[PDB]
UniProtKB/Swiss-Prot annotation:
Coiled coil: none annotated. The lineage of its organism: Bacteria, Thermotogati, Thermotogota, Thermotogae, Thermotogales. GO terms for cellular component: cytosol. Participates in transcription elongation, termination and antitermination. GO terms for biological process: DNA-templated transcription termination; regulation of DNA-templated transcription elongation; transcription antitermination; transcription elongation-coupled chromatin remodeling. Belongs to the NusG family. PANTHER family: RHO-INTERACTING TRANSCRIPTION TERMINATION FACTOR NUSG, TRANSCRIPTION TERMINATION_ANTITERMINATION PROTEIN NUSG. This is Transcription termination/antitermination protein NusG. Residues 290-324 form the KOW domain.
Length: 341
């Protein structure tokens, strides 16, 4: 029913959590121990993306800058495609979409090379291209702009023709192409879904960074590292009495509790709050120099004093030393989360 710190040897925290969890299982005593937390700090650990997903500007994102995700999470969703006007399909054509990002950055060049023109072998995401270099195995469709491919995708070009003769062009991603809905000669109606929505899941675990442009959205996922904030501490939620005490105290590798005199001290609310926030167990809201005293104003460690120790501009990051549990503790955070006092 309350938080207590269990002492272990530095670097044995995880074993103690497992042991405790097992003892609970092998024992059937399930009313003593609740949640068990080993406060870790997730830091960036990648010089560049481990996934870069490129998406339409109309892509619903289920993530957001700074967010941390696991290898299977839904990170985005592309809406369905709808016929803008009524008419008949007059052409359906296999077409490769090749999106080139140029050194002049900022916005991208999309190409559509008819499959019947042979897509050049050797073209992949990451491939450098220069002007004059063909993209098609034959003539036509030459690259007009030096850059790199950031997306290549098979599609169907669907041309719907209105009764008076005008035309709408849609590019259907192949994997959602629907042979019975989408075929030359078929009547489409305004509002008709020509293709379903698409989902997207993290190919990798890490921290997301999204670019939100009018030209396109991106999700980038970077490999992160985890660092135990307090070696030798295990925070365990538990009723505290003889039985609970002895129950956890006698776990292998459990060395004791943090306690003044007798029965162990339940962590002060103020000191536990960062633990909880780091644990995702609570849902929460200029010229700095090394050695500067600052106040954390946001985040897990909100309301804590600190000392700048490391500064990382062009990332607007700070490593500041904070005292919790009378322990000097380096925490990473954004400049937007501190004040210079």
């Amino acid at each position: 029913k309350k938080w207590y710190i269990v002492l272990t040897m530095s670097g044995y925290e995880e074993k103690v959590k497992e042991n405790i969890e097992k003892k609970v299982e092998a024992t059937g005593i399930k009313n003593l121990v609740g949640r068990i937390v080993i406060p870790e700090e997730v830091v960036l650990d990648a010089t560049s993306p481990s996934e870069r997903l490129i998406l339409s500007p109309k892509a619903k994102l289920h993530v957001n800058n700074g967010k941390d995700v696991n290898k299977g999470d839904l990170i985005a969703e592309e809406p369905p495609i709808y016929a803008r006007r009524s008419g008949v399909i007059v052409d359906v054509k296999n077409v490769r979409k090749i999106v080139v990002e140029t050194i002049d950055r900022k916005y991208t060049k999309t190409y559509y090379i008819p499959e019947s023109a042979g897509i050049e072998p050797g073209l992949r995401v990451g491939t450098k291209v220069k002007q004059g270099l063909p993209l098609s195995k034959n003539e036509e469709y030459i690259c007009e702009l030096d850059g790199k491919i950031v997306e290549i995708e098979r599609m169907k070009k669907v041309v719907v023709q209105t009764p008076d003769g005008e035309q709408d062009v849609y590019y259907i991603p192949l994997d959602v192409f629907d042979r019975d809905r989408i075929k030359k000669g078929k009547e489409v109606k305004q509002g008709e879904m020509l293709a379903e929505a698409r989902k997207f899941f993290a190919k990798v675990s890490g921290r997301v960074e999204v670019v939100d442009y009018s030209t396109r959205k991106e999700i980038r996922i970077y490999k992160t590292k985890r660092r135990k904030l307090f070696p030798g501490y295990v925070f365990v939620e538990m009723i505290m009495n003889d039985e609970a005490y002895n129950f956890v105290r006698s776990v292998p590798y459990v060395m004791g509790f943090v306690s003044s005199g007798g029965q162990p001290v339940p962590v002060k609310d103020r000191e536990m709050r960062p633990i909880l926030r780091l644990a995702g167990l609570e849902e929460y809201e200029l010229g700095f120099k090394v050695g500067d005293m600052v106040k954390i104003i946001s985040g897990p460690f909100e309301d804590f004093a600190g000392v700048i120790k490391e500064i990382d501009p062009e990332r607007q990051e700070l490593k500041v030393n904070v005292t919790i549990f009378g322990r000097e503790t380096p925490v990473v955070l954004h400049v937007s989360e501190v004040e210079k006092i």
